[PDB]
Amino acid sequence: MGDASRVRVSGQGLHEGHTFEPAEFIIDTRDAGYGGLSLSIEGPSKVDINTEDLEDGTCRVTYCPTEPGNYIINIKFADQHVPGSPFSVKVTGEGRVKESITRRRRAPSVANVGSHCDLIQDMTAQVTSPSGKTHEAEIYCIRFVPAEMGTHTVSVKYKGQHVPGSPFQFTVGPLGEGGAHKVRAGGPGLERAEAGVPAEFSIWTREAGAGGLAIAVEGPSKAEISFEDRKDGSCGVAYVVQEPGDYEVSVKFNEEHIPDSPFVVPVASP
Numbered sequence: 001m002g003d004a005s006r007v008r009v010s011g012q013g014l015h016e017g018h019t020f021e022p023a024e025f026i027i028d029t030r031d032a033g034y035g036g037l038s039l040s041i042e043g044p045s046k047v048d049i050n051t052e053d054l055e056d057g058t059c060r061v062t063y064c065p066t067e068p069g070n071y072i073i074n075i076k077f078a079d080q081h082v083p084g085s086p087f088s089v090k091v092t093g094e095g096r097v098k099e100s101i102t103r104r105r106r107a108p109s110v111a112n113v114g115s116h117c118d119l120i121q122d123m124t125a126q127v128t129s130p131s132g133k134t135h136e137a138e139i140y141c142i143r144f145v146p147a148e149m150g151t152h153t154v155s156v157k158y159k160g161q162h163v164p165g166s167p168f169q170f171t172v173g174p175l176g177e178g179g180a181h182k183v184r185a186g187g188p189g190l191e192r193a194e195a196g197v198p199a200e201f202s203i204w205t206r207e208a209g210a211g212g213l214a215i216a217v218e219g220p221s222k223a224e225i226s227f228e229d230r231k232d233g234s235c236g237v238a239y240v241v242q243e244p245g246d247y248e249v250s251v252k253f254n255e256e257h258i259p260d261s262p263f264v265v266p267v268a269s270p
């Protein structure tokens with residue numbers, strides 16, 4: 001003597017929410033006759049819920065999600081799911097844990113001193129200063145003395161072809177920004193992971209001088225992470241995450257997202 005299909009549910013909170021912001025929907029039971037309402041909201045965490053019997057025999061439901069991601073709202077009437085139920089809700093916001101490692105090189109001065117080496121002998125090496133002046137460099141180990149501050153470009157060629165790692169950049173002085181677009185990344189840790197199993201990827205910033213590279217994993221639990229600078233100038237990153245869920249791995253170079261960052265990374269259980 002009730003009819004679940006006559007139950008109507010509407011409102012933004014049926015499809016969309018935001019972290020620490022109330023999401024709301026109306027349950028209209030007026031045409032459903034006799035029967036009880038049961039309601040649950042399942043997702044990354046349990047969600048506080050409020051209801052208000054409105055004047056017009058309607059019931060306003062208000063919920064507050066504390067963690068982003070994919071939720072579902074179960075609405076049953078007389079132990080039967082109503083039309084549209086369960087409703088998929090996507091909740092945007094900051095993951096609850098953000099785990100980052102951020103690698104920086106600073107070199108705040110220029111000084112006409114070639115007492116160092118910051119950078120099979122038929123090799124041509126050229127350097128282009130920030131002001132665009134290109135000049136040939138002596139030669140492993142390139143001897144060029146920057147006179148200018150800013151991002152330099154450095155190309156090393158054998159037979160007139162670039163070697164491994166060339167062309168690259170060499171920034172001296174105060175960092176500010178820029179260069180994120182030319183940064184590269186790849187590895188399975190950038191599209192999926194398994195809880196408790198290391199997930200790797202590599203980064204090539206092509207920056208031989210000053211720069212800042214921030215790798216972050218944001219999502220429902222803690223991460224263990226490791227980072228290695230490699231001989232070739234690349235970066236290895238590995239992370240182990242504690243719980244299954246939807247995570248975000250972001251690579252920022254001098255404060256800007258590299259081209260596919262942040263990468264959505266579903267993490268499965270063991």
Ligand SMILES: [Br-]
Nearest residue numbers: 187200201202
């Ligand atoms: Br990799």
